[PDB]
Structure formats: structure tokens, C-alpha cells
Amino acid sequence: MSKPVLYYDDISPPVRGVLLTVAALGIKDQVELKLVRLFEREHLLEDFVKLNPLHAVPVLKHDDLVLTDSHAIIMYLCDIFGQDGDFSLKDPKQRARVHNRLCFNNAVLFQRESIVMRGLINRSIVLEDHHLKPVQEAYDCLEVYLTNSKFVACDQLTVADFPIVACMSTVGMVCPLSTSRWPKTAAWFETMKQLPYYQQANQVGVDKLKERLHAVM
Amino acid sequence: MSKPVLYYDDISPPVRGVLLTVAALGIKDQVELKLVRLFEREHLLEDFVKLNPLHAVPVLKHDDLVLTDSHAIIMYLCDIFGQDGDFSLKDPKQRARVHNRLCFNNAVLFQRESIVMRGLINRSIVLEDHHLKPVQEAYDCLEVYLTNSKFVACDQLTVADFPIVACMSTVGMVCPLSTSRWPKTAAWFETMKQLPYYQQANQVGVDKLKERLHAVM
Ligand SMILES: O=c1cc(-c2ccc(O)c(O)c2)oc2cc(O)cc(O)c12
Ligand SMILES: O=c1cc(-c2ccc(O)c(O)c2)oc2cc(O)cc(O)c12
Ligand SMILES: N[C@@H](CCC(=O)N[C@@H](CS)C(=O)NCC(=O)O)C(=O)O
Ligand SMILES: N[C@@H](CCC(=O)N[C@@H](CS)C(=O)NCC(=O)O)C(=O)O
Ligand SMILES: [Ca+2]
Ligand SMILES: [Ca+2]
Ligand SMILES: [Ca+2]
Ligand SMILES: [Ca+2]
Ligand SMILES: [Ca+2]
Ligand SMILES: [Ca+2]
Ligand SMILES: [Ca+2]
Ligand SMILES: [Ca+2]
């Protein structure tokens, strides 16, 4: 009878990875949302900093549990809401396959794209090929993964596809996928855009960020 | 009867997080090691790149499972070797608490310290206060965590303490902990250095890196 509370701003790819997960698990009505707007600096308020000293979104509070990383939020939601469904992580090797690709997103893809995007928002940068090489190297890895399995972690859609597509749909606005160069990734990307919950859970926030990018450029 | 194989170089903090975990779980005799030496560029050999397109250590192979992130390796080893022991992740909230701090290491602490250390090794940088501010901000977060619990994830030692101490003992060589400024973290650090397996699993590799740092400086 205790509902997790997701502190969020959907311009954020980490947040949209969680929103995609919530919709895919069918648990929109079980997870309360609390908006923490980055542009208005609500993530720097004293209450939120006390909740998360990293002053970042997303955060999940569930009773006394406070999770402060989208990838930990996603695996936890899988454990308590998805054990007996298509997204289950009950099997140890399947859990590790999915966790391995969550780590790829958190430590590789998201790190490299947020350097580029944050720099454009804050105006540190104004786009040499040097900036996009790390992103393109991450695309190369993703292309290998999607050559060996149909989705990022295995032949079925898993929660690991959601943080990655949230990032891909963001950095794609400055480093677009070439179908000739990354054909498996381009086809996987088109497939994820056809998921019924993609528009509400990811595209809305992507559109907001695109507007901020066109204002800064 | 199938032994996981850890591809490793102990100069790496991610690798040493795993070596600490292996020793703490008491499974040194169950995990085979295969040396992949970074300085000699063994991580760029065709076989290793095929195994891991990120061309990085550590990698764990267990039958057909290939894990390519230390934090995924650590949780998997917990699942298959530590279910009924002091490091167990069977409980969903405990798993999420531990995973949350693994994410902090992978996405915050390790990211910020590897920028500084890689730059010193490759000679991109030669140490303004600008470089160490992100590390000190990560120390500030760690200090909050260790104010609220005795170890990084809860009041017991968990596998999340190991990747973090591996990083702390590395970046500490250029950004040392002040006991007056981060007292809980300094005391936690001294406590981890007293673990019986710390010298072999972490200090050996730290010493090797210290020598490379003094050669480049
Ligand atoms: O750290 C911030 C990060 C971002 C952000 C937004 C979209 C991305 O795809 C991304 O990788 C980062 O947007 C902000 C917007 C703000 O007003 C203040 C901030 O600190 C941030
Ligand atoms: O990427 C590399 C990273 C490192 C490394 C070593 C110690 C650290 O605490 C760290 O954060 C990174 O050492 C290398 C050493 C090499 O010879 C080649 C490399 O690519 C690397
Ligand atoms: N690894 C974290 C990253 C979270 C993160 O960096 N969020 C950004 C937005 S994309 C944020 O809230 N930044 C605000 C700040 O850094 O002050 C996760 O996946 O949750
Ligand atoms: N998030 C990864 C990071 C692994 C990583 O970056 N390893 C470095 C050494 S610390 C490496 O092997 N770098 C070689 C390269 O990038 O070519 C993990 O935790 O396993
Ligand atoms: Ca409601
Ligand atoms: Ca307003
Ligand atoms: Ca309040
Ligand atoms: Ca208050
Ligand atoms: Ca042996
Ligand atoms: Ca040699
Ligand atoms: Ca071979
Ligand atoms: Ca070969």
C-alpha cells in the first residue's frame, strides 16, 4: 500500500529511461511523480539536496529507501513489480546481462553524451569532430551488441533498452545515426520508437530539450 | 564445475573493486584470472576486442556470459557465490541500496577520478584546483553517505564498499582526504585498509600505479 515516489524532469535522459520502464512494466498507476524542474533550479532546494546530495534527477523514494541513480531505480522497480512478467530479472544470468548493459549506458553512453549536451546548454562549447568521436565509439559498441542479439541485452526487449534509447534519442539531435554505418542500431532505434508508450514517456521530453537546444543555438 | 574467468590488470580501480570482492566472498579459488596488461596494450588485441568492444578491464566470462563492467561482475559474483553469507543481496531493498552505491562509483566517483588520472598518464594535464573540484564534490557526497550509515550502503560492509575504496585509494594520491574536512570518510578509509585482503587485492595495484605516476611526473 506504499507507492514509490519518482522525483523527475523528463528533459533528462536518465529520467526518461525510468519513465519508459514504468510504462513498459504497466505500473504508471503505482508510481507517484513529483516534478523537480532543472531549468528552474528546483534540484538545488534544501529539501531535495538533503534527499540526494548529488542534486540530480531521477530519485526514487519508497518508504525509507532512497535511490539516486536511474539504473538502480529501474532494477528495483523490476524486482518489486516485474518478477513474473516479460521483463523479469529473476534468473541470475539474465539479471547480469541486463545489468551489464545498464552499466554501459550509465558509464559510457550517458557519460559521453551528457558532456556534449551539458556543454551546449551551458555554452562551454559552440561541434568539431573531436566532440562526437566518443559518442560514435559508443555507437560502434552498441552496433556490436545489436549484431549479437536482437535487443541490447538479449533477443527480447528488456529494461536495459530504455536508458539506452533515452540517450540515443537525445544525443541523436547532434550526432545522428547513419543507417549505412550503424544499420542494426538504426533499425533497433526505429523499432523502439514504435513502442506505444514511447511518445508520452520519451518523445515529450526530447521535444522540450530540442527547443532548449535551438534557443541556445 | 564451470569457473568464471576474470580478465584483469590490477593497476585499474575497477579491477581492484572486483579483486577485493573475490577475496571478501572467499572465492579466490573459484575465479580464474587472466592477465590483460594495459601498459603493454594487451587490451587492444583482436581476441580481447572481440570479447569486449570497449577494450577495457575487467571482463568476466562464465560459460557464454560475458560481463564487461566491474559493477555488473561484482553483483553477479554476489548472486552465484554469496547468497547465504554476509554479503548477500537476496533482499530487494538491500540489493537496491548496494546497487545504488555501485552506480555512484561507476557514474560519479570513478568517472571524475579517471579523468584526472588518465590525463596525468597520457600527459594531457601537468593540478589546478579546477581539476580536483569534481572529486572533492564526490567526497562530499561520500561523507554524507557515511554519516547516515557506518559503511557506504548500510551499517554493514557490503560489496559496494570495494569499488569505492579502490577509487579512493587511487585518486587519493593526487587529492588526499582531509580528516578535518571528511572525518567519516577518512575513518571509513582507514577501516577498509585494515581488512586482511586489502594489501594483496588493492595495495599491490595502487603501488604499481604510484610508480607510473612518479615516472610521468
Ligand atoms: O546538469 C544538468 C544536465 C542537463 C541535461 C539535459 C539533457 C541531457 O541529455 C543531459 O545529458 C543533461 O540539464 C540541466 C539543466 C539545468 O537547468 C541545470 C543543470 O544542472 C542541468
Ligand atoms: O585507459 C586507460 C586507463 C588507465 C587507468 C589507470 C588507473 C586509473 O585509476 C584509471 O582511472 C585509469 O590506465 C591505462 C594504461 C594504458 O597503458 C592504456 C590505457 O588506455 C589506460
Ligand atoms: N547516473 C545518474 C545521472 C543523473 C543526472 O546526471 N541527472 C542530471 C540530468 S540528465 C541532473 O539532474 N543534473 C543536475 C545537476 O547535476 O545539478 C542517473 O542515471 O540517474
Ligand atoms: N565502468 C567500467 C570501466 C572500465 C575501465 O574504464 N577500465 C580501464 C582501466 S581503469 C581500461 O581498461 N581502459 C582501457 C581503454 O579504455 O582502452 C568498469 O567499471 O568496469
Ligand atoms: Ca496520481
Ligand atoms: Ca515556473
Ligand atoms: Ca521540508
Ligand atoms: Ca527543509
Ligand atoms: Ca589457478
Ligand atoms: Ca612484457
Ligand atoms: Ca584466438
Ligand atoms: Ca583471433
Tab-separated table of N, CA and C in Angstrom, chain A residues 13-139:
chain	number	residue	atom	x	y	z
A	13	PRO	N	17.614	12.410	-19.960
A	13	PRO	CA	17.593	11.015	-20.445
A	13	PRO	C	17.520	10.001	-19.307
A	14	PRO	N	18.310	10.136	-18.218
A	14	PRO	CA	18.118	9.190	-17.100
A	14	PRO	C	16.682	9.107	-16.615
A	15	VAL	N	15.992	10.250	-16.516
A	15	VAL	CA	14.588	10.242	-16.102
A	15	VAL	C	13.736	9.484	-17.110
A	16	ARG	N	13.943	9.762	-18.397
A	16	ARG	CA	13.114	9.116	-19.409
A	16	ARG	C	13.366	7.614	-19.488
A	17	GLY	N	14.577	7.150	-19.155
A	17	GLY	CA	14.770	5.714	-19.021
A	17	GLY	C	13.829	5.109	-17.997
A	18	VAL	N	13.617	5.819	-16.889
A	18	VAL	CA	12.705	5.344	-15.860
A	18	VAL	C	11.262	5.458	-16.328
A	19	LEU	N	10.898	6.576	-16.969
A	19	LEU	CA	9.512	6.721	-17.415
A	19	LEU	C	9.154	5.644	-18.431
A	20	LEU	N	10.081	5.322	-19.340
A	20	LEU	CA	9.844	4.225	-20.278
A	20	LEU	C	9.645	2.908	-19.537
A	21	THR	N	10.488	2.650	-18.528
A	21	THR	CA	10.382	1.439	-17.724
A	21	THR	C	9.040	1.359	-17.007
A	22	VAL	N	8.608	2.466	-16.398
A	22	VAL	CA	7.347	2.475	-15.660
A	22	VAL	C	6.191	2.123	-16.586
A	23	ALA	N	6.188	2.695	-17.787
A	23	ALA	CA	5.127	2.417	-18.751
A	23	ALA	C	5.214	0.991	-19.262
A	24	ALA	N	6.430	0.510	-19.522
A	24	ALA	CA	6.596	-0.844	-20.048
A	24	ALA	C	6.178	-1.903	-19.039
A	25	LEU	N	6.428	-1.666	-17.750
A	25	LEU	CA	6.019	-2.588	-16.703
A	25	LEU	C	4.531	-2.492	-16.383
A	26	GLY	N	3.829	-1.525	-16.969
A	26	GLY	CA	2.423	-1.295	-16.657
A	26	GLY	C	2.157	-0.804	-15.250
A	27	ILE	N	3.008	0.081	-14.728
A	27	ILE	CA	2.881	0.481	-13.328
A	27	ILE	C	2.760	1.991	-13.174
A	28	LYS	N	2.262	2.677	-14.206
A	28	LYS	CA	2.067	4.124	-14.100
A	28	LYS	C	1.197	4.486	-12.904
A	29	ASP	N	0.186	3.672	-12.611
A	29	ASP	CA	-0.716	3.991	-11.514
A	29	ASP	C	-0.161	3.596	-10.155
A	30	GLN	N	1.015	2.973	-10.108
A	30	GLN	CA	1.615	2.565	-8.854
A	30	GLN	C	2.804	3.422	-8.454
A	31	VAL	N	3.253	4.328	-9.319
A	31	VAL	CA	4.422	5.164	-9.059
A	31	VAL	C	3.970	6.614	-9.132
A	32	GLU	N	4.010	7.303	-7.996
A	32	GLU	CA	3.673	8.713	-7.972
A	32	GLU	C	4.843	9.530	-8.497
A	33	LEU	N	4.517	10.616	-9.178
A	33	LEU	CA	5.511	11.502	-9.747
A	33	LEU	C	5.596	12.759	-8.895
A	34	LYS	N	6.801	13.308	-8.788
A	34	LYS	CA	6.967	14.624	-8.188
A	34	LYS	C	7.952	15.399	-9.046
A	35	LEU	N	7.471	16.472	-9.653
A	35	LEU	CA	8.260	17.232	-10.602
A	35	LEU	C	9.345	18.018	-9.875
A	36	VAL	N	10.575	17.912	-10.365
A	36	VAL	CA	11.711	18.680	-9.878
A	36	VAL	C	12.324	19.308	-11.123
A	37	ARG	N	12.011	20.578	-11.382
A	37	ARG	CA	12.354	21.192	-12.661
A	37	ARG	C	13.789	21.727	-12.656
A	38	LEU	N	14.629	21.187	-13.546
A	38	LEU	CA	16.036	21.562	-13.592
A	38	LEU	C	16.225	23.020	-14.018
A	39	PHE	N	15.503	23.455	-15.056
A	39	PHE	CA	15.686	24.823	-15.536
A	39	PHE	C	15.333	25.846	-14.474
A	40	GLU	N	14.436	25.508	-13.566
A	40	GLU	CA	14.083	26.483	-12.552
A	40	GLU	C	14.855	26.283	-11.272
A	41	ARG	N	15.790	25.330	-11.278
A	41	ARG	CA	16.740	25.060	-10.202
A	41	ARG	C	16.077	24.464	-8.962
A	42	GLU	N	14.979	23.732	-9.151
A	42	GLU	CA	14.334	23.053	-8.032
A	42	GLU	C	15.190	21.922	-7.475
A	43	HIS	N	16.162	21.429	-8.243
A	43	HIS	CA	17.047	20.392	-7.731
A	43	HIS	C	18.086	20.932	-6.768
A	44	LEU	N	18.163	22.248	-6.584
A	44	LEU	CA	19.099	22.833	-5.641
A	44	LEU	C	18.430	23.295	-4.350
A	45	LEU	N	17.125	23.076	-4.208
A	45	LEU	CA	16.427	23.395	-2.971
A	45	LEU	C	16.935	22.521	-1.823
A	46	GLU	N	16.867	23.051	-0.604
A	46	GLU	CA	17.456	22.365	0.540
A	46	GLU	C	16.842	20.978	0.746
A	47	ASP	N	15.511	20.846	0.611
A	47	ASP	CA	14.883	19.539	0.808
A	47	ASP	C	15.414	18.522	-0.196
A	48	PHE	N	15.562	18.926	-1.448
A	48	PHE	CA	15.991	17.955	-2.448
A	48	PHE	C	17.459	17.592	-2.263
A	49	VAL	N	18.308	18.565	-1.915
A	49	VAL	CA	19.717	18.279	-1.672
A	49	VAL	C	19.860	17.332	-0.483
A	50	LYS	N	19.010	17.496	0.541
A	50	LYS	CA	19.049	16.575	1.675
A	50	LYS	C	18.647	15.171	1.236
A	51	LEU	N	17.673	15.079	0.335
A	51	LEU	CA	17.258	13.792	-0.211
A	51	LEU	C	18.363	13.159	-1.057
A	52	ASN	N	19.047	13.962	-1.869
A	52	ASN	CA	20.064	13.485	-2.812
A	52	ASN	C	21.205	14.500	-2.882
A	53	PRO	N	22.338	14.247	-2.215
A	53	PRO	CA	23.437	15.225	-2.262
A	53	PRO	C	24.029	15.416	-3.642
A	54	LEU	N	23.761	14.504	-4.582
A	54	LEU	CA	24.163	14.708	-5.968
A	54	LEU	C	23.291	15.736	-6.681
A	55	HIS	N	22.215	16.203	-6.034
A	55	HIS	CA	21.297	17.215	-6.577
A	55	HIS	C	20.958	16.950	-8.044
A	56	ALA	N	20.528	15.716	-8.309
A	56	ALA	CA	20.226	15.296	-9.669
A	56	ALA	C	18.961	14.452	-9.700
A	57	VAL	N	18.339	14.403	-10.872
A	57	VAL	CA	17.159	13.565	-11.102
A	57	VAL	C	17.521	12.436	-12.064
A	58	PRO	N	16.870	11.271	-11.964
A	58	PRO	CA	15.770	10.938	-11.050
A	58	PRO	C	16.192	10.468	-9.663
A	59	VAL	N	15.248	10.552	-8.729
A	59	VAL	CA	15.354	9.966	-7.400
A	59	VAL	C	14.073	9.177	-7.172
A	60	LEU	N	14.188	8.010	-6.547
A	60	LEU	CA	13.022	7.235	-6.139
A	60	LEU	C	13.025	7.090	-4.626
A	61	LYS	N	11.926	7.475	-3.990
A	61	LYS	CA	11.734	7.212	-2.575
A	61	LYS	C	10.652	6.164	-2.408
A	62	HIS	N	10.966	5.118	-1.654
A	62	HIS	CA	9.997	4.064	-1.369
A	62	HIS	C	10.138	3.707	0.097
A	63	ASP	N	9.173	4.144	0.914
A	63	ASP	CA	9.336	4.141	2.363
A	63	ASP	C	10.626	4.861	2.742
A	64	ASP	N	11.561	4.176	3.402
A	64	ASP	CA	12.814	4.803	3.803
A	64	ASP	C	13.942	4.563	2.804
A	65	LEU	N	13.667	3.841	1.721
A	65	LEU	CA	14.651	3.621	0.667
A	65	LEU	C	14.725	4.837	-0.248
A	66	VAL	N	15.934	5.348	-0.466
A	66	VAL	CA	16.147	6.462	-1.386
A	66	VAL	C	17.177	6.032	-2.428
A	67	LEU	N	16.729	5.884	-3.670
A	67	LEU	CA	17.601	5.534	-4.788
A	67	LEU	C	17.889	6.787	-5.599
A	68	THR	N	19.156	6.975	-5.960
A	68	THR	CA	19.635	8.221	-6.547
A	68	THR	C	20.400	7.951	-7.831
A	69	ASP	N	19.959	6.944	-8.579
A	69	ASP	CA	20.502	6.673	-9.904
A	69	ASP	C	19.439	5.926	-10.677
A	70	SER	N	19.143	6.431	-11.879
A	70	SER	CA	18.098	5.854	-12.723
A	70	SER	C	18.273	4.357	-12.917
A	71	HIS	N	19.527	3.886	-13.022
A	71	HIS	CA	19.739	2.478	-13.315
A	71	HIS	C	19.412	1.606	-12.109
A	72	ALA	N	19.679	2.109	-10.896
A	72	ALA	CA	19.265	1.411	-9.687
A	72	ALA	C	17.752	1.468	-9.525
A	73	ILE	N	17.139	2.610	-9.853
A	73	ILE	CA	15.680	2.721	-9.820
A	73	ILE	C	15.043	1.671	-10.721
A	74	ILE	N	15.583	1.519	-11.933
A	74	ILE	CA	14.994	0.614	-12.916
A	74	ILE	C	15.081	-0.835	-12.442
A	75	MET	N	16.231	-1.257	-11.899
A	75	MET	CA	16.330	-2.653	-11.465
A	75	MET	C	15.442	-2.910	-10.255
A	76	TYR	N	15.325	-1.930	-9.360
A	76	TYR	CA	14.462	-2.092	-8.195
A	76	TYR	C	13.001	-2.234	-8.606
A	77	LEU	N	12.542	-1.372	-9.516
A	77	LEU	CA	11.160	-1.464	-9.992
A	77	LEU	C	10.901	-2.806	-10.655
A	78	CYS	N	11.901	-3.338	-11.352
A	78	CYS	CA	11.777	-4.675	-11.921
A	78	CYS	C	11.606	-5.724	-10.838
A	79	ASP	N	12.355	-5.587	-9.744
A	79	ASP	CA	12.337	-6.589	-8.690
A	79	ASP	C	11.006	-6.615	-7.957
A	80	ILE	N	10.393	-5.453	-7.732
A	80	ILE	CA	9.189	-5.440	-6.908
A	80	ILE	C	7.903	-5.437	-7.728
A	81	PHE	N	7.959	-5.078	-9.012
A	81	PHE	CA	6.764	-5.047	-9.847
A	81	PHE	C	6.810	-5.970	-11.059
A	82	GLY	N	7.973	-6.511	-11.431
A	82	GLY	CA	8.058	-7.243	-12.681
A	82	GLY	C	8.555	-8.675	-12.603
A	83	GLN	N	8.496	-9.288	-11.417
A	83	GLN	CA	9.127	-10.594	-11.213
A	83	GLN	C	8.518	-11.683	-12.088
A	84	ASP	N	7.212	-11.626	-12.344
A	84	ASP	CA	6.511	-12.690	-13.055
A	84	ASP	C	6.022	-12.243	-14.433
A	85	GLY	N	6.727	-11.300	-15.056
A	85	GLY	CA	6.330	-10.789	-16.355
A	85	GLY	C	7.431	-10.838	-17.396
A	86	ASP	N	7.207	-10.180	-18.539
A	86	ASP	CA	8.122	-10.237	-19.676
A	86	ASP	C	9.451	-9.538	-19.416
A	87	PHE	N	9.561	-8.777	-18.330
A	87	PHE	CA	10.757	-8.003	-18.026
A	87	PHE	C	11.484	-8.552	-16.807
A	88	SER	N	11.152	-9.777	-16.398
A	88	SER	CA	11.632	-10.335	-15.142
A	88	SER	C	13.151	-10.471	-15.120
A	89	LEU	N	13.734	-10.201	-13.950
A	89	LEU	CA	15.163	-10.368	-13.718
A	89	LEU	C	15.455	-11.482	-12.716
A	90	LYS	N	14.534	-12.444	-12.575
A	90	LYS	CA	14.694	-13.490	-11.568
A	90	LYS	C	15.898	-14.381	-11.848
A	91	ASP	N	16.215	-14.611	-13.111
A	91	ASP	CA	17.313	-15.515	-13.437
A	91	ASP	C	18.648	-14.789	-13.303
A	92	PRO	N	19.629	-15.376	-12.613
A	92	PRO	CA	20.875	-14.638	-12.328
A	92	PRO	C	21.657	-14.223	-13.561
A	93	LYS	N	21.751	-15.075	-14.585
A	93	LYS	CA	22.496	-14.655	-15.768
A	93	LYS	C	21.733	-13.604	-16.554
A	94	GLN	N	20.399	-13.714	-16.608
A	94	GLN	CA	19.606	-12.688	-17.278
A	94	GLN	C	19.713	-11.351	-16.560
A	95	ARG	N	19.660	-11.371	-15.229
A	95	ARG	CA	19.874	-10.146	-14.465
A	95	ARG	C	21.229	-9.528	-14.790
A	96	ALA	N	22.277	-10.355	-14.874
A	96	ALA	CA	23.616	-9.835	-15.130
A	96	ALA	C	23.743	-9.298	-16.557
A	97	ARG	N	23.123	-9.963	-17.538
A	97	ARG	CA	23.113	-9.442	-18.909
A	97	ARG	C	22.481	-8.053	-18.975
A	98	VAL	N	21.342	-7.890	-18.298
A	98	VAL	CA	20.644	-6.616	-18.288
A	98	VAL	C	21.456	-5.580	-17.520
A	99	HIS	N	21.947	-5.953	-16.330
A	99	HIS	CA	22.755	-5.028	-15.541
A	99	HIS	C	23.997	-4.593	-16.313
A	100	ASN	N	24.612	-5.518	-17.057
A	100	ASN	CA	25.791	-5.171	-17.842
A	100	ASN	C	25.505	-4.046	-18.836
A	101	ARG	N	24.350	-4.086	-19.505
A	101	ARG	CA	24.015	-3.020	-20.445
A	101	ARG	C	23.537	-1.751	-19.751
A	102	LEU	N	22.933	-1.859	-18.565
A	102	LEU	CA	22.662	-0.645	-17.778
A	102	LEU	C	23.967	0.067	-17.437
A	103	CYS	N	24.981	-0.700	-17.019
A	103	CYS	CA	26.296	-0.123	-16.745
A	103	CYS	C	26.887	0.534	-17.990
A	104	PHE	N	26.732	-0.099	-19.161
A	104	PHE	CA	27.194	0.535	-20.392
A	104	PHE	C	26.526	1.884	-20.590
A	105	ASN	N	25.216	1.961	-20.350
A	105	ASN	CA	24.568	3.257	-20.511
A	105	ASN	C	25.092	4.258	-19.492
A	106	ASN	N	25.131	3.866	-18.218
A	106	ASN	CA	25.472	4.822	-17.167
A	106	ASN	C	26.916	5.288	-17.285
A	107	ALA	N	27.837	4.368	-17.582
A	107	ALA	CA	29.261	4.663	-17.513
A	107	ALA	C	29.885	5.013	-18.859
A	108	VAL	N	29.190	4.769	-19.971
A	108	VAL	CA	29.758	5.020	-21.295
A	108	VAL	C	28.855	5.959	-22.089
A	109	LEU	N	27.695	5.469	-22.536
A	109	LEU	CA	26.867	6.263	-23.438
A	109	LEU	C	26.383	7.552	-22.777
A	110	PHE	N	25.782	7.457	-21.585
A	110	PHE	CA	25.285	8.678	-20.949
A	110	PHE	C	26.424	9.620	-20.595
A	111	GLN	N	27.558	9.085	-20.126
A	111	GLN	CA	28.673	9.967	-19.786
A	111	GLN	C	29.119	10.776	-20.992
A	112	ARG	N	29.220	10.136	-22.157
A	112	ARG	CA	29.760	10.812	-23.328
A	112	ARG	C	28.755	11.777	-23.931
A	113	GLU	N	27.486	11.422	-23.919
A	113	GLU	CA	26.540	12.358	-24.497
A	113	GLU	C	26.261	13.532	-23.566
A	114	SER	N	26.268	13.323	-22.246
A	114	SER	CA	25.977	14.441	-21.353
A	114	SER	C	27.098	15.472	-21.366
A	115	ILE	N	28.336	15.054	-21.633
A	115	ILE	CA	29.423	16.017	-21.795
A	115	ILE	C	29.106	16.970	-22.941
A	116	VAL	N	28.638	16.419	-24.062
A	116	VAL	CA	28.332	17.242	-25.227
A	116	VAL	C	27.106	18.114	-24.963
A	117	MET	N	26.031	17.521	-24.438
A	117	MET	CA	24.782	18.265	-24.278
A	117	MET	C	24.899	19.332	-23.192
A	118	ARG	N	25.440	18.973	-22.016
A	118	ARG	CA	25.637	19.968	-20.959
A	118	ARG	C	26.502	21.121	-21.442
A	119	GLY	N	27.544	20.818	-22.216
A	119	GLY	CA	28.398	21.875	-22.732
A	119	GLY	C	27.657	22.818	-23.658
A	120	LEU	N	26.727	22.285	-24.438
A	120	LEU	CA	25.938	23.140	-25.361
A	120	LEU	C	24.949	23.984	-24.551
A	121	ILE	N	24.243	23.382	-23.603
A	121	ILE	CA	23.295	24.126	-22.729
A	121	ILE	C	24.034	25.236	-21.965
A	122	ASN	N	25.166	24.925	-21.323
A	122	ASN	CA	25.884	25.933	-20.503
A	122	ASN	C	26.707	26.864	-21.402
A	123	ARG	N	26.782	26.583	-22.701
A	123	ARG	CA	27.544	27.394	-23.694
A	123	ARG	C	29.065	27.237	-23.570
A	124	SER	N	29.569	26.196	-22.901
A	124	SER	CA	31.033	25.945	-22.895
A	124	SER	C	31.502	25.672	-24.326
A	125	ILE	N	30.696	24.947	-25.109
A	125	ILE	CA	31.093	24.578	-26.499
A	125	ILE	C	30.123	25.247	-27.475
A	126	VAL	N	30.600	25.592	-28.674
A	126	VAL	CA	29.732	26.204	-29.721
A	126	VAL	C	30.340	25.938	-31.098
A	127	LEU	N	30.598	22.279	-32.989
A	127	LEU	CA	30.696	20.837	-32.763
A	127	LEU	C	31.759	20.258	-33.689
A	128	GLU	N	33.013	20.394	-33.267
A	128	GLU	CA	34.100	19.766	-34.001
A	128	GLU	C	33.972	18.250	-33.920
A	129	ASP	N	34.552	17.565	-34.912
A	129	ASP	CA	34.532	16.107	-34.919
A	129	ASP	C	35.170	15.518	-33.669
A	130	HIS	N	36.019	16.286	-32.981
A	130	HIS	CA	36.618	15.806	-31.741
A	130	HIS	C	35.557	15.533	-30.683
A	131	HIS	N	34.509	16.363	-30.628
A	131	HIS	CA	33.499	16.209	-29.582
A	131	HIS	C	32.681	14.937	-29.755
A	132	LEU	N	32.418	14.531	-30.995
A	132	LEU	CA	31.495	13.437	-31.264
A	132	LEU	C	32.180	12.086	-31.426
A	133	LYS	N	33.506	12.050	-31.495
A	133	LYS	CA	34.197	10.767	-31.602
A	133	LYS	C	33.850	9.820	-30.458
A	134	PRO	N	33.868	10.232	-29.180
A	134	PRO	CA	33.489	9.272	-28.125
A	134	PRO	C	32.071	8.746	-28.276
A	135	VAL	N	31.123	9.593	-28.693
A	135	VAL	CA	29.762	9.118	-28.928
A	135	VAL	C	29.742	8.094	-30.056
A	136	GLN	N	30.477	8.364	-31.137
A	136	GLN	CA	30.479	7.436	-32.258
A	136	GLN	C	31.121	6.109	-31.884
A	137	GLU	N	32.120	6.136	-30.995
A	137	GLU	CA	32.695	4.898	-30.478
A	137	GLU	C	31.673	4.113	-29.659
A	138	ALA	N	30.826	4.821	-28.899
A	138	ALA	CA	29.762	4.151	-28.166
A	138	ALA	C	28.743	3.545	-29.117
A	139	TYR	N	28.427	4.257	-30.215
A	139	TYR	CA	27.573	3.692	-31.256
A	139	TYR	C	28.173	2.408	-31.810
